[PDB]
Protein backbone atom coordinates (compact mmCIF):
# COMPACT_ATOMS: atom_id res chain seq x y z
CA UNK A 1 0.00 0.00 0.00
CA UNK A 2 1.37 3.38 0.97
CA UNK A 3 4.84 2.88 2.51
CA UNK A 4 5.13 4.21 6.07
CA UNK A 5 7.89 4.01 8.68
CA UNK A 6 7.47 4.09 12.45
CA UNK A 7 9.76 6.43 14.38
CA UNK A 8 10.81 5.81 18.00
CA UNK A 9 8.30 6.92 20.59
CA UNK A 10 5.42 5.28 18.73
CA UNK A 11 3.38 2.95 20.97
CA UNK A 12 4.00 4.91 24.16
CA UNK A 13 1.74 6.78 26.57
CA UNK A 14 3.29 10.11 27.48
CA UNK A 15 0.84 11.47 30.04
CA UNK A 16 1.04 15.07 28.79
CA UNK A 17 0.29 14.65 25.09
CA UNK A 18 -2.43 16.27 22.99
CA UNK A 19 -3.68 13.65 20.55
CA UNK A 20 -7.08 12.88 19.10
CA UNK A 21 -9.24 10.20 20.64
CA UNK A 22 -12.33 8.29 19.48
CA UNK A 23 -15.53 9.27 21.24
CA UNK A 24 -17.15 6.61 23.40
CA UNK A 25 -20.72 7.87 22.91
CA UNK A 26 -21.26 9.47 19.52
CA UNK A 27 -24.80 10.27 18.28
CA UNK A 28 -25.68 11.50 21.78
CA UNK A 29 -26.39 15.21 21.01
CA UNK A 30 -25.22 16.84 24.25
CA UNK A 31 -27.02 19.64 26.05
CA UNK A 32 -26.27 23.12 24.64
CA UNK A 33 -24.71 25.81 26.78
CA UNK A 34 -26.24 28.55 28.89
CA UNK A 35 -25.44 32.04 30.17
CA UNK A 36 -24.43 31.51 33.81
CA UNK A 37 -23.13 34.57 35.70
CA UNK A 38 -19.57 34.71 36.92
CA UNK A 39 -17.31 33.01 34.39
CA UNK A 40 -13.59 32.68 35.10
CA UNK A 41 -10.98 32.86 32.35
CA UNK A 42 -7.76 33.10 34.39
CA UNK A 43 -6.59 32.41 37.93
CA UNK A 44 -5.20 35.91 38.47
CA UNK A 45 -8.62 37.53 38.71
CA UNK A 46 -9.31 35.35 41.73
CA UNK A 47 -6.10 36.75 43.21
CA UNK A 48 -7.00 40.39 42.54
CA UNK A 49 -9.82 40.53 45.12
CA UNK A 50 -9.34 41.48 48.76
CA UNK A 51 -9.00 39.11 51.71
CA UNK A 52 -8.55 39.62 55.44
CA UNK A 53 -5.08 38.83 56.80
CA UNK A 54 -4.57 37.04 60.16
CA UNK A 55 -1.90 39.37 61.56
CA UNK A 56 -2.61 38.45 65.19
CA UNK A 57 -1.81 34.71 65.25
CA UNK A 58 -0.29 34.72 68.75
CA UNK A 59 -0.68 30.96 69.47
CA UNK A 60 -4.21 31.11 70.93
CA UNK A 61 -6.17 33.29 68.48
CA UNK A 62 -5.88 30.93 65.51
CA UNK A 63 -9.04 29.05 66.52
CA UNK A 64 -11.03 32.29 66.76
CA UNK A 65 -12.03 35.44 64.92
CA UNK A 66 -9.49 37.28 67.08
CA UNK A 67 -6.70 36.28 64.69
CA UNK A 68 -7.69 39.06 62.31
CA UNK A 69 -8.05 41.94 64.79
CA UNK A 70 -5.00 44.10 65.53
CA UNK A 71 -5.56 45.59 69.01
CA UNK A 72 -5.15 49.30 69.68
CA UNK A 73 -5.13 50.87 73.14
CA UNK A 74 -4.17 54.35 74.30
CA UNK A 75 -0.83 53.67 75.97
CA UNK A 76 1.43 55.97 77.99
CA UNK A 77 4.76 55.58 76.17
CA UNK A 78 6.04 58.05 73.57
CA UNK A 79 6.24 55.95 70.43
CA UNK A 80 5.62 52.21 70.46
CA UNK A 81 5.11 49.46 67.91
CA UNK A 82 1.64 48.20 67.03
CA UNK A 83 2.45 45.25 64.77
CA UNK A 84 5.04 44.10 62.28
CA UNK A 85 5.36 41.12 59.98
CA UNK A 86 8.02 40.12 57.44
CA UNK A 87 7.54 39.32 53.77
CA UNK A 88 9.64 36.16 53.68
CA UNK A 89 7.55 33.73 51.60
CA UNK A 90 6.71 30.18 52.62
CA UNK A 91 8.31 30.22 56.09
CA UNK A 92 4.91 30.22 57.89
CA UNK A 93 4.26 33.94 57.38
CA UNK A 94 0.83 35.54 57.68
CA UNK A 95 0.15 35.97 53.95
CA UNK A 96 0.13 32.22 53.38
CA UNK A 97 -3.45 31.08 53.88
CA UNK A 98 -5.07 34.07 52.18
CA UNK A 99 -6.92 34.15 48.88
CA UNK A 100 -3.83 35.27 46.99
CA UNK A 101 -1.31 33.31 49.06
CA UNK A 102 -2.91 29.95 48.25
CA UNK A 103 -2.91 30.55 44.50
CA UNK A 104 0.78 31.47 44.50
CA UNK A 105 1.50 28.15 46.21
CA UNK A 106 0.48 26.34 43.03
CA UNK A 107 3.42 27.96 41.22
CA UNK A 108 7.17 27.71 41.64
CA UNK A 109 8.29 31.26 40.78
CA UNK A 110 6.29 34.48 40.95
CA UNK A 111 6.87 38.23 41.14
CA UNK A 112 4.77 41.35 41.53
CA UNK A 113 3.42 43.84 44.05
CA UNK A 114 1.01 43.85 46.98
CA UNK A 115 -1.82 46.17 47.98
CA UNK A 116 -2.02 46.38 51.77
CA UNK A 117 -5.21 48.15 52.86
CA UNK A 118 -5.89 48.85 56.53
CA UNK A 119 -9.18 49.77 58.15
CA UNK A 120 -9.68 51.41 61.54
CA UNK A 121 -12.68 49.70 63.13
CA UNK A 122 -13.01 52.01 66.09
CA UNK A 123 -15.31 54.77 67.28
CA UNK A 124 -16.28 57.74 65.14
CA UNK A 125 -15.24 60.21 67.86
CA UNK A 126 -11.62 59.03 68.15
CA UNK A 127 -8.53 60.71 66.72
CA UNK A 128 -4.99 59.45 66.29
CA UNK A 129 -1.99 59.07 64.04
CA UNK A 130 0.03 56.07 62.88
CA UNK A 131 3.15 55.36 60.88
CA UNK A 132 3.26 52.74 58.15
CA UNK A 133 6.86 51.97 57.30
CA UNK A 134 8.23 49.59 54.68
CA UNK A 135 11.79 48.41 55.07
CA UNK A 136 13.30 47.33 51.74
CA UNK A 137 15.38 44.12 51.58
CA UNK A 138 18.81 44.89 52.98
CA UNK A 139 17.76 47.38 55.64
CA UNK A 140 16.99 45.96 59.05
CA UNK A 141 13.83 46.24 61.08
CA UNK A 142 13.75 49.77 62.55
CA UNK A 143 14.15 49.71 66.31
CA UNK A 144 12.65 53.16 66.90
CA UNK A 145 10.03 55.55 65.60
CA UNK A 146 12.67 58.03 64.47
CA UNK A 147 14.67 55.83 62.13
CA UNK A 148 11.44 54.29 60.86
CA UNK A 149 10.48 57.84 59.89
CA UNK A 150 13.53 58.34 57.68
CA UNK A 151 12.57 55.43 55.39
CA UNK A 152 9.51 55.11 53.20
CA UNK A 153 6.46 55.77 55.33
CA UNK A 154 2.89 57.07 55.26
CA UNK A 155 1.50 59.12 58.14
CA UNK A 156 -2.03 57.81 58.67
CA UNK A 157 -4.42 60.26 60.32
CA UNK A 158 -7.40 58.26 61.53
CA UNK A 159 -9.82 61.16 62.03
CA UNK A 160 -9.56 62.26 58.39
CA UNK A 161 -9.83 58.93 56.57
CA UNK A 162 -10.42 55.37 57.72
CA UNK A 163 -8.30 53.49 55.15
CA UNK A 164 -4.68 53.88 54.09
CA UNK A 165 -3.07 51.87 51.29
CA UNK A 166 0.63 50.96 51.18
CA UNK A 167 1.80 49.33 47.95
CA UNK A 168 4.78 47.00 48.23
CA UNK A 169 6.69 44.58 45.95
CA UNK A 170 6.76 40.87 46.76
CA UNK A 171 9.05 38.34 45.08
CA UNK A 172 10.10 34.73 45.57
CA UNK A 173 16.34 39.95 54.60
CA UNK A 174 13.21 40.36 52.50
CA UNK A 175 11.20 43.19 54.08
CA UNK A 176 9.07 44.35 56.99
CA UNK A 177 5.74 46.19 57.14
CA UNK A 178 5.98 47.55 60.71
CA UNK A 179 3.59 50.18 62.11
CA UNK A 180 4.17 52.69 64.90
CA UNK A 181 2.27 54.92 67.31
CA UNK A 182 2.83 58.51 66.23
CA UNK A 183 0.47 60.19 68.70
CA UNK A 184 -1.84 58.69 71.27
CA UNK A 185 -5.55 58.02 70.81
CA UNK A 186 -7.63 60.99 71.93
CA UNK A 187 -11.19 60.10 72.90
CA UNK A 188 -14.14 61.91 74.46
CA UNK A 189 -15.96 60.89 77.62
CA UNK A 190 -18.30 57.87 77.65
CA UNK A 191 -16.51 56.41 74.60
CA UNK A 192 -14.36 53.29 74.86
CA UNK A 193 -10.66 53.55 74.03
CA UNK A 194 -9.90 49.97 72.98
CA UNK A 195 -10.28 49.86 69.19
CA UNK A 196 -9.28 47.41 66.45
CA UNK A 197 -7.60 47.48 63.02
CA UNK A 198 -8.17 45.10 60.10
CA UNK A 199 -5.88 44.45 57.14
CA UNK A 200 -6.72 43.36 53.59
CA UNK A 201 -4.35 42.11 50.89
CA UNK A 202 -4.61 41.95 47.10
CA UNK A 203 -2.49 42.01 43.94
CA UNK A 204 -2.08 45.47 42.45
CA UNK A 205 -0.71 44.79 38.98
CA UNK A 206 -0.74 41.50 37.10
CA UNK A 207 1.62 38.90 38.54
CA UNK A 208 3.90 36.57 36.59
CA UNK A 209 3.60 32.91 37.54
CA UNK A 210 5.60 30.07 36.02
CA UNK A 211 6.17 26.31 36.53
CA UNK A 212 2.93 25.02 38.06
CA UNK A 213 3.31 22.39 40.77
CA UNK A 214 1.20 20.96 43.59
CA UNK A 215 0.37 22.56 46.91
CA UNK A 216 1.72 21.28 50.25
CA UNK A 217 -1.47 22.16 52.13
CA UNK A 218 -3.49 19.04 51.24
CA UNK A 219 -2.41 15.42 51.50
CA UNK A 220 -3.82 11.93 51.67
CA UNK A 221 -3.06 8.41 52.88
CA UNK A 222 -6.17 6.37 52.05
CA UNK A 223 -8.85 6.83 49.40
CA UNK A 224 -11.96 8.71 50.45
CA UNK A 225 -14.87 6.29 50.22
CA UNK B 1 4.31 33.60 31.95
CA UNK B 2 1.03 35.33 31.09
CA UNK B 3 -0.84 32.20 29.97
CA UNK B 4 0.38 29.73 32.60
CA UNK B 5 -2.43 30.77 34.97
CA UNK B 6 -5.31 30.24 32.54
CA UNK B 7 -8.02 27.67 33.18
CA UNK B 8 -6.98 25.19 30.48
CA UNK B 9 -3.37 25.40 31.66
CA UNK B 10 -4.54 24.71 35.23
CA UNK B 11 -6.94 21.78 34.92
CA UNK B 12 -6.04 19.94 31.69
CA UNK B 13 -3.53 17.64 33.39
CA UNK B 14 -3.62 13.85 33.59
CA UNK B 15 -4.03 12.20 36.97
CA UNK B 16 -4.33 8.63 38.23
CA UNK B 17 -7.71 8.30 39.95
CA UNK B 18 -8.27 4.57 40.50
CA UNK B 19 -6.26 1.38 40.87
CA UNK B 20 -7.67 -2.13 41.23
CA UNK B 21 -6.75 -5.74 40.52
CA UNK B 22 -8.78 -8.72 39.34
CA UNK B 23 -8.29 -12.46 38.83
CA UNK B 24 -9.84 -14.55 36.09
CA UNK B 25 -10.91 -17.87 37.63
CA UNK B 26 -12.05 -16.63 41.04
CA UNK B 27 -15.70 -15.80 40.16
CA UNK B 28 -15.19 -12.70 42.31
CA UNK B 29 -12.52 -10.90 40.27
CA UNK B 30 -13.76 -8.08 38.03
CA UNK B 31 -13.26 -4.37 38.52
CA UNK B 32 -15.74 -1.55 39.07
CA UNK B 33 -15.37 2.22 39.43
CA UNK B 34 -17.96 4.99 39.35
CA UNK B 35 -16.65 8.05 37.54
CA UNK B 36 -16.18 10.86 40.05
CA UNK B 37 -13.35 13.18 41.02
CA UNK B 38 -13.96 13.01 44.78
CA UNK B 39 -11.52 10.22 45.65
CA UNK B 40 -8.11 11.86 45.30
CA UNK B 41 -7.34 14.96 47.36
CA UNK B 42 -5.08 16.80 44.90
CA UNK B 43 -7.54 16.75 42.01
CA UNK B 44 -10.53 17.49 44.24
CA UNK B 45 -9.09 20.74 45.55
CA UNK B 46 -8.57 22.17 42.07
CA UNK B 47 -12.08 21.38 40.87
CA UNK B 48 -13.63 22.76 44.08
CA UNK B 49 -12.46 26.29 43.41
CA UNK B 50 -15.51 26.67 41.16
CA UNK B 51 -19.18 25.90 41.64
CA UNK B 52 -20.14 24.93 38.08
CA UNK B 53 -17.86 23.07 35.69
CA UNK B 54 -18.40 21.74 32.18
CA UNK B 55 -15.75 19.62 30.51
CA UNK B 56 -15.24 16.73 28.14
CA UNK B 57 -13.74 13.55 29.53
CA UNK B 58 -10.82 11.40 28.40
CA UNK B 59 -9.66 8.17 30.00
CA UNK B 60 -6.63 5.92 29.49
CA UNK B 61 -6.10 2.48 30.99
CA UNK B 62 -2.71 0.95 31.79
CA UNK B 63 -3.29 -2.79 32.21
CA UNK B 64 -0.54 -5.21 33.20
CA UNK B 65 -0.58 -8.83 34.35
CA UNK B 66 1.10 -11.38 36.60
CA UNK B 67 1.53 -15.15 36.68
CA UNK B 68 0.02 -16.42 39.92
CA UNK B 69 1.50 -19.76 41.08
CA UNK B 70 -0.10 -22.78 39.40
CA UNK B 71 0.53 -26.46 40.09
CA UNK B 72 3.01 -27.77 37.45
CA UNK B 73 3.50 -29.01 33.88
CA UNK B 74 4.53 -26.36 31.37
CA UNK B 75 2.46 -23.20 31.59
CA UNK B 76 2.38 -21.61 28.13
CA UNK B 77 -0.40 -19.14 27.46
CA UNK B 78 -1.42 -16.99 24.49
CA UNK B 79 -1.98 -13.23 24.74
CA UNK B 80 -4.76 -11.96 26.98
CA UNK B 81 -7.69 -9.80 25.90
CA UNK B 82 -9.55 -7.49 28.27
CA UNK B 83 -12.95 -5.83 28.05
CA UNK B 84 -13.64 -2.36 29.45
CA UNK B 85 -17.39 -1.73 29.55
CA UNK B 86 -18.80 1.76 30.03
CA UNK B 87 -22.28 1.96 31.55
CA UNK B 88 -24.08 5.26 30.80
CA UNK B 89 -26.06 6.74 33.72
CA UNK B 90 -29.29 4.78 33.87
CA UNK B 91 -28.12 1.48 32.46
CA UNK B 92 -27.88 -2.18 33.46
CA UNK B 93 -25.09 -3.21 35.80
CA UNK B 94 -23.38 -6.60 36.18
CA UNK B 95 -23.52 -8.59 39.40
CA UNK B 96 -21.18 -11.44 38.41
CA UNK B 97 -18.49 -11.87 35.79
CA UNK B 98 -20.73 -14.01 33.54
CA UNK B 99 -23.88 -11.95 33.06
CA UNK B 100 -26.25 -10.66 30.40
CA UNK B 101 -25.44 -7.04 31.27
CA UNK B 102 -22.07 -7.28 29.54
CA UNK B 103 -23.59 -8.18 26.18
CA UNK B 104 -26.06 -5.30 25.96
CA UNK B 105 -25.83 -3.19 22.84
CA UNK B 106 -26.14 0.24 24.44
CA UNK B 107 -23.14 -0.11 26.77
CA UNK B 108 -20.10 0.71 24.58
CA UNK B 109 -17.01 -1.35 25.35
CA UNK B 110 -13.43 -1.57 24.14
CA UNK B 111 -11.38 -4.72 23.63
CA UNK B 112 -7.60 -4.77 23.80
CA UNK B 113 -4.85 -7.40 23.75
CA UNK B 114 -1.59 -7.28 25.67
CA UNK B 115 1.40 -5.73 23.96
CA UNK B 116 -0.03 -2.66 22.21
CA UNK B 117 -0.74 0.98 22.95
CA UNK B 118 -3.08 1.46 25.92
CA UNK B 119 -6.81 1.82 25.17
CA UNK B 120 -7.88 5.47 25.21
CA UNK B 121 -11.56 6.42 24.95
CA UNK B 122 -13.30 9.78 25.29
CA UNK B 123 -16.67 10.75 26.76
CA UNK B 124 -18.38 14.10 25.99
CA UNK B 125 -20.32 16.29 28.40
CA UNK B 126 -23.02 13.85 29.48
CA UNK B 127 -25.60 15.52 31.75
CA UNK B 128 -29.17 16.75 31.51
CA UNK B 129 -28.22 20.10 33.04
CA UNK B 130 -25.80 22.65 31.68
CA UNK B 131 -22.92 22.24 34.16
CA UNK B 132 -21.55 19.80 36.66
CA UNK B 133 -22.29 21.19 40.11
CA UNK B 134 -19.49 20.58 42.59
CA UNK B 135 -21.58 21.97 45.48
CA UNK B 136 -25.32 21.37 45.84
CA UNK B 137 -27.17 22.82 48.85
CA UNK B 138 -30.32 20.74 48.87
CA UNK B 139 -31.81 17.29 48.60
CA UNK B 140 -32.25 14.89 45.71
CA UNK B 141 -30.54 12.47 51.02
CA UNK B 142 -28.67 15.72 51.60
CA UNK B 143 -26.32 17.24 49.05
CA UNK B 144 -26.19 14.46 46.45
CA UNK B 145 -27.69 15.78 43.16
CA UNK B 146 -28.02 12.72 40.87
CA UNK B 147 -28.08 15.10 37.87
CA UNK B 148 -24.26 15.06 37.64
CA UNK B 149 -23.71 11.32 37.29
CA UNK B 150 -21.13 10.41 34.67
CA UNK B 151 -21.39 6.63 34.53
CA UNK B 152 -19.60 3.47 35.64
CA UNK B 153 -16.72 1.37 34.28
CA UNK B 154 -16.35 -2.41 34.53
CA UNK B 155 -13.38 -4.55 33.51
CA UNK B 156 -12.85 -8.29 33.03
CA UNK B 157 -10.87 -10.88 31.11
CA UNK B 158 -12.47 -12.49 28.07
CA UNK B 159 -9.97 -15.37 27.79
CA UNK B 160 -10.92 -18.58 29.56
CA UNK B 161 -7.76 -19.85 31.23
CA UNK B 162 -7.01 -23.43 32.18
CA UNK B 163 -3.49 -23.98 33.46
CA UNK B 164 -2.45 -20.81 35.26
CA UNK B 165 -4.20 -18.17 37.33
CA UNK B 166 -3.44 -14.65 36.13
CA UNK B 167 -4.19 -11.46 38.02
CA UNK B 168 -4.22 -8.11 36.26
CA UNK B 169 -4.11 -4.55 37.51
CA UNK B 170 -5.53 -1.48 35.81
CA UNK B 171 -4.73 2.18 36.47
CA UNK B 172 -7.11 4.80 35.10
CA UNK B 173 -5.86 8.22 34.04
CA UNK B 174 -8.23 11.16 34.07
CA UNK B 175 -8.06 14.28 31.97
CA UNK B 176 -10.56 17.13 31.58
CA UNK B 177 -10.82 18.77 28.20
CA UNK B 178 -12.18 22.16 27.08
CA UNK B 179 -12.90 23.30 30.61
CA UNK B 180 -15.39 26.03 31.44
CA UNK B 181 -15.70 27.26 35.02
CA UNK B 182 -18.22 29.54 36.71
CA UNK B 183 -18.66 31.16 40.15
CA UNK B 184 -15.29 30.98 41.95
CA UNK B 185 -15.14 29.82 45.54
CA UNK B 186 -12.54 29.94 48.34
CA UNK B 187 -10.06 27.06 48.61
CA UNK B 188 -10.54 24.37 51.23
CA UNK B 189 -8.69 24.78 54.53
CA UNK B 190 -9.59 21.75 56.64
CA UNK B 191 -8.77 18.21 55.62
CA UNK B 192 -11.17 16.11 53.60
CA UNK B 193 -12.93 13.44 55.62
CA UNK B 194 -15.56 11.75 53.45
CA UNK B 195 -16.28 11.48 49.75
CA UNK B 196 -19.97 12.22 49.30
CA UNK B 197 -20.46 15.18 51.64
CA UNK B 198 -18.50 18.22 52.79
CA UNK B 199 -18.15 17.28 56.46
CA UNK B 200 -15.06 18.30 58.40
CA UNK B 201 -13.55 18.89 61.81
CA UNK B 202 -12.62 22.46 62.75
CA UNK B 203 -9.04 23.63 62.39
CA UNK B 204 -7.05 26.78 63.04
CA UNK B 205 -6.89 29.64 60.59
CA UNK B 206 -3.12 29.50 60.05
CA UNK B 207 0.19 28.50 61.59
CA UNK B 208 0.82 30.44 64.78
CA UNK B 209 3.71 32.56 66.03
CA UNK B 210 4.87 33.97 69.35
CA UNK B 211 4.27 37.72 69.12
CA UNK B 212 2.47 40.22 66.93
CA UNK B 213 5.56 42.45 66.81
Amino acid at each position, epitope marked *: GLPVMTTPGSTQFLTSDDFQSPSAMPQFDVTPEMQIPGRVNNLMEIAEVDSVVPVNNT*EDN*V*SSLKAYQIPVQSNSDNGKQVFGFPLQPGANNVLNRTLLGEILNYYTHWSGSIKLTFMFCGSAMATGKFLLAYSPPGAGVPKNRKDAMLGTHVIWDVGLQSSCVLCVPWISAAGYVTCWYQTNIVVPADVQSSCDILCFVSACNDFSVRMLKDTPFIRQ*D*TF*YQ | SRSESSIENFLCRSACVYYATYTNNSKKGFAEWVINTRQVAQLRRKLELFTYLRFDLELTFVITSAQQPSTASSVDAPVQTHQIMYVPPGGPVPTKVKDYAWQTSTNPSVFWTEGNAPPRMSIPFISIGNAYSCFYDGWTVYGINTLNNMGTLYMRHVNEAGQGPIKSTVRIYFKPKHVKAWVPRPPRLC*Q*Y*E*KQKNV*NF*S*P*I*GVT*T*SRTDII
Partner: nanobody
Amino acid sequence: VQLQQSAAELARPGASVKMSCKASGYTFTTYTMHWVKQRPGQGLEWIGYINPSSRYTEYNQKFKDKTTLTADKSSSTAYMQLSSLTFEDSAVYYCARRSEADRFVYWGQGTLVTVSA
Protein backbone atom coordinates in the same frame (compact mmCIF):
# COMPACT_ATOMS: atom_id res chain seq x y z
CA VAL C 1 6.70 9.78 60.38
CA GLN C 2 6.17 7.84 63.62
CA LEU C 3 4.91 8.39 67.16
CA GLN C 4 6.68 7.84 70.48
CA GLN C 5 5.15 7.27 73.91
CA SER C 6 6.55 7.36 77.43
CA ALA C 7 7.74 4.38 79.47
CA ALA C 8 5.75 2.01 81.66
CA GLU C 9 5.03 3.19 85.20
CA LEU C 10 3.70 2.10 88.59
CA ALA C 11 1.35 3.78 91.05
CA ARG C 12 -0.70 3.17 94.17
CA PRO C 13 -4.51 3.05 93.92
CA GLY C 14 -5.78 6.55 94.61
CA ALA C 15 -2.86 8.42 93.02
CA SER C 16 -2.46 9.90 89.53
CA VAL C 17 -0.55 8.77 86.43
CA LYS C 18 0.23 11.00 83.45
CA MET C 19 1.45 9.61 80.13
CA SER C 20 2.73 11.25 76.95
CA CYS C 21 2.64 10.54 73.22
CA LYS C 22 5.18 12.59 71.27
CA ALA C 23 4.47 12.92 67.55
CA SER C 24 7.10 13.70 64.93
CA GLY C 25 7.19 13.85 61.15
CA TYR C 26 4.22 16.06 60.30
CA THR C 27 2.29 19.19 61.18
CA PHE C 28 1.13 18.28 64.67
CA THR C 29 -1.79 20.73 64.82
CA THR C 30 -3.69 19.26 61.86
CA TYR C 31 -4.81 15.74 62.80
CA THR C 32 -6.61 14.75 65.97
CA MET C 33 -4.90 12.38 68.40
CA HIS C 34 -6.85 9.60 70.11
CA TRP C 35 -6.41 7.24 73.05
CA VAL C 36 -7.35 3.54 73.14
CA LYS C 37 -7.21 1.28 76.21
CA GLN C 38 -6.46 -2.45 75.95
CA ARG C 39 -7.35 -4.46 79.02
CA PRO C 40 -5.60 -7.86 78.71
CA GLY C 41 -8.84 -9.84 79.02
CA GLN C 42 -10.93 -8.20 76.31
CA GLY C 43 -10.58 -6.13 73.15
CA LEU C 44 -9.76 -2.47 72.74
CA GLU C 45 -11.81 0.29 74.37
CA TRP C 46 -12.13 3.88 73.19
CA ILE C 47 -11.35 6.75 75.57
CA GLY C 48 -11.43 10.02 73.67
CA TYR C 49 -9.60 12.45 71.45
CA ILE C 50 -8.27 16.00 71.45
CA ASN C 51 -8.39 18.50 68.61
CA PRO C 52 -4.94 20.09 69.05
CA SER C 53 -5.66 23.27 67.08
CA SER C 54 -8.39 24.31 69.52
CA ARG C 55 -7.79 22.11 72.63
CA TYR C 56 -11.32 20.71 72.36
CA THR C 57 -11.64 17.25 73.88
CA GLU C 58 -14.58 14.85 73.84
CA TYR C 59 -14.64 11.70 75.95
CA ASN C 60 -16.51 8.43 75.82
CA GLN C 61 -19.13 8.25 78.56
CA LYS C 62 -17.41 5.31 80.26
CA PHE C 63 -14.26 7.37 80.96
CA LYS C 64 -15.60 10.92 81.28
CA ASP C 65 -15.06 11.69 84.97
CA LYS C 66 -11.37 10.72 85.13
CA THR C 67 -9.26 11.32 82.02
CA THR C 68 -8.00 14.75 80.98
CA LEU C 69 -6.34 14.95 77.57
CA THR C 70 -4.09 17.98 77.12
CA ALA C 71 -1.61 18.95 74.43
CA ASP C 72 1.17 21.43 73.82
CA LYS C 73 2.27 22.92 70.53
CA SER C 74 5.91 23.53 71.42
CA SER C 75 7.24 20.04 72.11
CA SER C 76 4.49 18.58 69.84
CA THR C 77 3.34 16.07 72.47
CA ALA C 78 -0.03 15.00 73.87
CA TYR C 79 -0.83 13.77 77.37
CA MET C 80 -3.45 11.85 79.33
CA GLN C 81 -3.92 11.96 83.11
CA LEU C 82 -5.61 9.13 85.01
CA SER C 83 -7.06 10.13 88.38
CA SER C 84 -8.48 7.80 91.06
CA LEU C 85 -6.88 4.53 90.01
CA THR C 86 -8.64 1.26 90.84
CA PHE C 87 -7.75 -2.41 90.17
CA GLU C 88 -9.62 -2.27 86.84
CA ASP C 89 -7.33 0.51 85.57
CA SER C 90 -4.44 -1.86 84.80
CA ALA C 91 -4.18 -2.05 81.02
CA VAL C 92 -2.13 -1.04 77.98
CA TYR C 93 -2.77 2.43 76.55
CA TYR C 94 -2.17 3.38 72.91
CA CYS C 95 -2.35 6.69 71.07
CA ALA C 96 -3.60 6.77 67.49
CA ARG C 97 -3.96 9.40 64.78
CA ARG C 98 -7.42 9.27 63.22
CA SER C 99 -7.36 10.19 59.55
CA GLU C 100 -10.05 10.07 56.84
CA ALA C 101 -12.69 10.24 59.63
CA ASP C 102 -12.61 6.60 60.72
CA ARG C 103 -9.21 5.07 59.92
CA PHE C 104 -6.44 4.86 62.52
CA VAL C 105 -3.40 4.77 60.26
CA TYR C 106 -0.54 5.36 62.72
CA TRP C 107 -0.37 3.86 66.21
CA GLY C 108 2.03 4.03 69.12
CA GLN C 109 3.90 1.26 70.90
CA GLY C 110 1.77 1.28 74.05
CA THR C 111 2.61 1.85 77.71
CA LEU C 112 1.74 -0.64 80.45
CA VAL C 113 0.19 0.92 83.55
CA THR C 114 -0.17 -1.33 86.60
CA VAL C 115 -1.65 -0.65 90.03
CA SER C 116 -0.13 -2.34 93.07
CA ALA C 117 1.08 -1.77 96.63
